[PDB]
Write a protein that binds this ligand. Structure first.
Ligand code: HEM
Ligand code: HEM
Ligand code: HEM
Ligand code: HEM
Ligand code: HEM
Ligand code: HEM
Ligand code: HEM
Ligand code: HEM
Ligand code: HEM
Ligand code: HEM
Ligand code: HEM
Ligand code: HEM
Ligand code: HEM
Ligand code: HEM
Ligand code: NA
Ligand code: NA
Ligand code: NA
Ligand code: NA
Ligand SMILES: [Zn+2]
Ligand SMILES: [Zn+2]
Ligand SMILES: [Zn+2]
Ligand SMILES: [Zn+2]
Length: 513
C-alpha cells in the first residue's frame, strides 16, 4: 500500500464526457468534468433557483434535461460545437472577469486529459433504513391515499389510461423495470434515479417548509465519506405491500401439457414474514420482479424462466436465490462454521432427514385432497390459511440430550507419546456450542433431534447417545487417527475464530520431558 501521503486526490465528482463516440472513433481523450466544482461555482453567480438552468434546459413539460446545453443528442457536428462554444465560452468570459476558471481555447489536453485523477465514487440505494426514512418523512406528502407515501415514487404503466400511475401494492424496486440502457420510453435506472430523486430533493429544499431533504450534489449521494454520515434507523418496521405472512410453494406445472408430470414430494409451507426480516431486500429472492417463483419456475421448466426447473430453483446448493443454497451460506457463520465446515454441508448431497423439514404434510386439508392436487386449485386464501397452520404445527428442538448422557470429560491418550493425553472439556464444549447456536431459527428447525448436534463431530455413524471411537474408522476412512483429531479439533477453533498469535500446542495437551 502506497504511503497515505502519496495516494492522490480522489473525487466522486467526475463526469467522463465521451458522448461523441456515439458518432464514431474519438480523435482525443474523453473530457473529465468535475461536476460539483462547477455547480458550487455557479450557485454563487446564479441568484435565483437558476443554478442548474445555466447548463441544463427543460423540456416542454418542465422536467430538467440531464444533458448539457441541449434536450437531445443530434449531430456529431452539432454536439462538438455545443461543447466548445459553451464550455470555452464561459471559461473565456470568466477569465476576462478575473475569475478562477476552466481551460481556454487552445488548452486541448487540459479538458482532453489522458491521465485524469482517481474516482472515489460509490453506488447508493435505499436500504431498509433509508427507505423507511422516506416512507416516514412528512415532507413527502401522501399521494392518492390518506397516509401512504408510496405514490410519490412508485408507479406502473396503466396500459389503457395511457398513463404511469401508482398502483397500490404493486410497487417494486426501480430495477425490476429500469435497466442499464433505456428500452423505449423507459429510462435507464441511471436517468430514472437522477430525475426523480434529485428533482424531489430540490423541491423540498426550495419549499417554504424548510424541511430536511436529500442530497443534490454528486458527492452528497456518491461520496463514501458522505454516506457514512446518513443517520440510520435500527428498527425499520416491516415493509407493508400486501404480502403473505405464510405461503404454499407448489409443484405448479407449466400451462403446457398435462409429459404427465405430477410431483414427487409433499408441498412446502414457507414462512414469508420471518424471511423478510432476515433479508436485506425483497429483490434478493425476487430477483427479476416481485411476483411468485412458479410463474417462471415449473415442474418441467419454461422459456420465461430460462427453463430453470423449480427443483433447481429451490435447491441449487450454489445459489443464494435457492432455499437450500442460501441456507448453505448462512451456515458459514462462525458460530455454525465449526460443525458445518467439518460436515461440508453445501458440498455433499443433502441428507434425506432434511427433506421432511420443508416437505411436510400440510395441516388443515384432507391428505387425499392434497395428492388430488387440492392446493393447486384452491383460493390464495385457503393456501395462506393452510400454510400458517402447517408452519404452526412444526416441531422445534431447544437444547440437546440431558447432561447425564453427555460425559463431562473424555481422555484421549490412545496416541500419547510426545504429549500427555488430552483432557477433552467434553460437556463444556457442547453447552457452549448450544449456547453459540442460541435461538437461531435455522438451527432450531433443521436440528430435528436433540441428539442431532452430536453428529457435528461424531459423523458417519448412526445417531446415538453412545457414538463409536474415532479410532473405529481411523488408522491403519482417509485421515489417520492423529490427523483426524488435529483436523477436527483445530479445524473448529479456527472456523469459530475464538483464539491467532495466542496459539500454543499446549492448549489441548501437555508436552512431556
Ligand atoms: C484547440 C484544442 C482542442 C481541440 C483540437 C479539440 C478537439 C476536439 C474534437 C476533435 C472533439 C470531438 C471528439 C473526439 O474526437 O475526441 C472534441 C470534443 C470535446 N471537446 Fe475539445 N478540443 C480542444 C479543446 C477543448 C477544451 C479546451 C475543452 C474544455 C473547455 C474541450 C471540450 C470538449 C468536450 C466537452 C468535447 C465533447 C466530449 C466527447 O469527446 O464526447 N475541448 N474536441
Ligand atoms: C445543482 C444544479 C444541477 C444539477 C442537479 C445537475 C445534475 C446533473 C445530473 C443528474 C447529471 C447526469 C449525471 C451522470 O449521469 O453522469 C448532470 C450532468 C452534467 N451536468 Fe449537471 N447539474 C446541475 C448543474 C450543472 C451546471 C451549472 C453545469 C455547467 C457548469 C452542469 C453541467 C453538466 C454536464 C456537462 C454534465 C454531463 C452531461 C453532458 O455531457 O451532457 N450541470 N448534471
Ligand atoms: C461541458 C463544458 C465544460 C467542460 C468540459 C469544463 C471543464 C472544466 C475543467 C476540466 C475544469 C478544471 C480546471 C482546473 O482544474 O483548474 C473546469 C473548471 C471551471 N469551470 Fe468548466 N467546463 C465546462 C463548462 C463550464 C461552464 C459552462 C462554466 C460557467 C458556468 C464553467 C465554469 C468553470 C469554473 C468557474 C471553473 C473553476 C471553478 C473551481 O475553481 O473549482 N465551466 N471546467
Ligand atoms: C409505503 C409505500 C411504499 C411501499 C409499500 C414501497 C415498497 C417498496 C418495495 C417492496 C420495494 C422493493 C424492495 C426490495 O426489493 O428490496 C421498494 C423499492 C424502492 N422504493 Fe419504495 N415503497 C413505498 C414508498 C416509497 C417512496 C415514497 C419512495 C421515494 C421517496 C420509494 C422509493 C423506493 C426506491 C428508490 C426503491 C429502490 C431501492 C433500491 O434498490 O435502491 N418508495 N419500495
Ligand atoms: C432513488 C432516488 C433517491 C435517493 C438515492 C435518495 C436518497 C436520500 C438520502 C441519502 C437521504 C438522506 C440524506 C441525509 O441524511 O443527509 C434522503 C433524504 C430525503 N429524501 Fe431522498 N432519495 C431519493 C429520492 C427521493 C424522492 C423521489 C423524494 C420525494 C418523494 C425524496 C425525499 C426525501 C426527503 C424529504 C428526505 C429528507 C427526510 C428526512 O430525513 O427528514 N427522496 N434521500
Ligand atoms: C451530478 C453528480 C452526479 C453524478 C456525476 C452521478 C453519476 C452517476 C452514474 C455515472 C451512475 C451510474 C453508474 C453505473 O451505471 O454503474 C449513477 C447512478 C445513480 N445515481 Fe448518481 N450521480 C450524481 C449525483 C447523484 C445524486 C445527488 C443522487 C441522489 C439523489 C444520485 C443517485 C444515483 C442513483 C440512485 C443511482 C443508481 C445506482 C445504481 O445504478 O444502482 N446521483 N450516478
Ligand atoms: C434432499 C431432500 C430433498 C429432496 C429429495 C427434495 C426434492 C424436491 C423435489 C423432487 C421437488 C419438486 C416438486 C415435487 O416433485 O414434489 C422439490 C420442490 C421444493 N423443495 Fe425440495 N427436496 C428436498 C429438501 C428440501 C428442503 C430442505 C427444502 C427447504 C429449504 C426444500 C424446499 C422445496 C421447495 C420450496 C420446493 C418447491 C415447492 C414444491 O413444488 O413443493 N426441499 N423438492
Ligand atoms: C419485503 C420484501 C418482499 C416483498 C414485498 C415480497 C412480496 C411477496 C408477494 C406479494 C408474494 C406473493 C406473490 C403472488 O402470489 O402474487 C411473495 C411470494 C414469495 N416470496 Fe416474497 N417478498 C419479499 C421478500 C422475500 C424474500 C427476502 C424472500 C426469500 C427469503 C421471499 C420469498 C418468497 C417466496 C418463496 C414466495 C412464494 C412464491 C411461490 O409460491 O411460488 N420474498 N412475496
Ligand atoms: C422468489 C421466487 C424465485 C426464486 C426463489 C427463484 C430462484 C431462481 C434460481 C435459484 C435460479 C438459478 C440459480 C441462479 O442463477 O442463481 C433462477 C434462475 C432464473 N429465474 Fe428465478 N426465481 C424466482 C422467481 C423468478 C421469476 C418470477 C422469474 C420471471 C419473471 C424468474 C426468472 C428466472 C430466469 C430467467 C432464470 C435464469 C437465469 C439464470 O440462469 O440465473 N425467476 N431463479
Ligand atoms: C422457498 C425456499 C425456502 C424455504 C422453504 C425456507 C425455509 C426455511 C425454514 C423452514 C426456516 C426456519 C424458520 C421458520 O420456518 O420460521 C428458514 C430460516 C431461514 N431462512 Fe429460509 N427458506 C427458503 C429460502 C431462503 C433463502 C433464499 C434465504 C436467503 C435469501 C433464506 C434465509 C433464511 C434465514 C436467514 C433463516 C433464519 C431465520 C432467522 O434466524 O430469523 N431462506 N428457512
Ligand atoms: C446457528 C448456526 C447454525 C445454523 C444456522 C445451522 C443450520 C443447519 C441447517 C440448515 C441444517 C440442515 C441442512 C442440511 O442438512 O443440509 C443443519 C444440520 C445439522 N447441523 Fe447445524 N446449524 C448451526 C450450527 C450447528 C452446530 C454448532 C452444530 C454442531 C454442534 C451443528 C450440527 C448439525 C448437524 C449434525 C446437522 C445434521 C447433518 C446431517 O443430516 O447429517 N449445527 N444445521
Ligand atoms: C501445532 C501444535 C501441536 C502439535 C505440535 C501437536 C502434536 C501432536 C502429536 C505429536 C500428537 C500425537 C500423540 C503424542 O505424541 O502425544 C498429538 C495428538 C493430539 N493432539 Fe495435538 N498438537 C498440536 C496442537 C493441538 C491442538 C491445538 C489440539 C486441540 C484443538 C490438539 C489435539 C490433539 C489430540 C486430541 C490428540 C490425540 C491425543 C492422544 O491420543 O494422545 N493438538 N498432537
Ligand atoms: C450431546 C451430543 C453428544 C453426545 C451424547 C456425545 C457422547 C459421547 C460419548 C458417549 C463418547 C465416548 C467417551 C469415551 O470413549 O469414554 C464421546 C466421545 C467424544 N466426543 Fe462426543 N458426544 C456428543 C457431542 C460431541 C460433539 C459436538 C463433539 C465435538 C465438539 C464431540 C466430540 C467427542 C470426542 C472428540 C470424543 C472422543 C472420542 C475418541 O477420542 O475416540 N462430541 N462422546
Ligand atoms: C478432540 C479435539 C478437541 C480438543 C482436544 C479440544 C480442546 C479444547 C480445550 C482444552 C478448550 C478450553 C480452552 C481453555 O479453557 O483455555 C476448548 C474450548 C472450546 N472448543 Fe475445543 N477441542 C476439540 C475440538 C473442538 C471442536 C471440533 C469444536 C467445534 C465443534 C470445538 C469448540 C470449542 C469451543 C467453542 C470452545 C470454547 C468453550 C468455552 O471456553 O466455553 N472444540 N477446546
Ligand atoms: Na455566463
Ligand atoms: Na480554437
Ligand atoms: Na403460493
Ligand atoms: Na497432524
Ligand atoms: Zn417474485
Ligand atoms: Zn381464511
Ligand atoms: Zn465438573
Ligand atoms: Zn484452539
Amino acid at each position: 500500500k502506497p504511503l497515505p501521503g502519496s495516494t492522490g486526490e480522489q473525487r466522486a465528482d467526475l463526469v467522463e464526457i465521451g458522448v461523441m463516440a456515439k458518432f464514431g472513433n474519438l480523435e482525443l481523450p474523453k473530457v473529465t468534468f468535475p461536476h460539483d466544482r462547477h455547480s458550487e461555482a455557479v450557485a454563487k453567480v446564479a441568484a435565483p433557483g437558476k443554478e442548474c438552468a445555466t447548463c441544463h434546459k427543460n423540456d416542454d413539460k418542465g422536467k430538467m434535461s440531464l444533458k448539457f446545453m441541449r434536450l437531445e443528442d443530434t449531430t456529431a457536428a452539432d454536439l462538438k460545437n455545443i461543447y466548445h462554444a459553451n464550455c470555452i465560452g464561459c471559461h473565456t468570459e470568466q477569465a476576462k472577469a478575473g475569475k478562477k476558471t476552466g481551460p481556454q481555447d487552445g488548452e486541448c489536453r487540459s479538458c482532453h486529459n489522458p491521465k485524469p485523477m482517481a474516482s472515489s465514487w460509490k453506488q447508493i440505494g435505499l436500504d431498509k433504513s433509508l427507505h423507511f426514512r422516506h416512507v416516514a418523512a412528512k415532507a413527502i406528502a401522501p399521494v392518492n391515499d390518506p397516509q401512504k407515501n408510496c405514490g410519490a415514487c412508485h408507479h406502473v404503466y396503466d396500459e389503457a389510461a395511457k398513463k404511469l400511475s401508482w398502483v397500490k401494492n404493486k410497487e417494486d424496486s426501480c430495477r425490476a423495470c429500469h435497466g442499464d440502457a433505456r428500452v423505449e420510453k423507459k429510462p435507464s435506472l441511471r436517468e430514472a434515479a437522477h430525475t426523480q430523486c434529485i428533482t424531489c430533493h430540490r423541491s423540498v429544499a426550495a419549499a417554504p417548509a424548510k424541511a430536511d431533504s436529500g442530497p443534490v450534489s454528486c458527492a452528497g449521494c456518491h461520496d463514501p465519506a458522505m454516506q457514512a454520515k446518513f443517520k440510520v434507523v435500527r428498527d425499520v418496521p416491516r415493509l407493508e405491500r400486501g404480502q403473505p405472512d405464510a405461503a404454499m410453494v407448489l409443484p405448479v406445472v407449466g400451462p403446457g401439457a398435462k409429459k404427465g408430470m405430477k410431483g414427487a414430494m409433499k408441498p412446502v409451507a414457507f414462512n414469508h414474514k420471518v424471511h423478510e426480516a432476515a433479508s436485506n431486500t425483497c429483490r434478493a429472492c425476487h430477483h427479476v420482479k416481485i411476483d411468485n417463483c412458479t410463474t417462471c419456475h415449473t415442474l418441467e421448466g419454461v422459456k420465461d424462466g430460462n427453463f430453470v426447473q423449480i427443483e433447481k430453483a429451490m435447491h441449487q446448493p450454489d445459489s443464494m436465490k435457492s432455499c437450500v443454497g442460501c441456507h448453505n451460506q448462512k451456515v458459514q457463520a462462525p458460530a455454525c462454521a465449526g460443525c458445518h465446515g467439518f460436515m461440508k454441508t453445501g458440498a455433499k448431497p443433502q441428507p434425506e432427514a432434511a427433506c421432511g423439514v420443508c416437505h411436510a404434510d400440510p395441516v388443515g386439508m384432507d391428505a387425499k385432497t392434497v395428492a388430488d392436487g387440492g392446493l393447486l386449485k384452491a383460493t390464495k386464501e385457503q393456501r395462506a390459511d393452510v400454510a400458517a397452520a402447517t408452519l404452526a404445527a412444526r416441531r422445534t428442538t431447544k437444547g440437546t440430550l440431558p447432561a447425564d448422557d453427555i460425559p463431562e470429560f473424555v481422555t484421549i491418550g490412545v496416541l500419547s507419546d510426545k504429549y500427555e493425553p488430552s483432557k477433552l472439556p467434553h460437556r463444556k464444549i457442547v453447552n457452549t456450542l448450544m449456547a453459540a447456536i442460541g435461538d437461531d431459527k435455522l438451527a432450531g428447525t433443521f436440528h430435528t433431534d436433540k441428539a442431532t448436534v452430536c453428529a457435528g463431530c461424531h459423523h458417519n455413524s448412526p445417531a446415538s447417545k453412545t457414538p463409536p471411537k474415532c479410532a473405529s474408522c481411523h488408522g491403519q476412512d482417509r485421515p489417520g487417527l492423529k490427523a483426524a483429531y488435529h483436523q477436527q479439533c483445530m479445524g473448529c477453533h479456527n472456523r469459530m475464530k475464538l483464539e491467532p498469535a495466542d496459539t500454543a500446542c499446549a492448549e489441548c495437551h501437555k508436552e512431556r520431558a
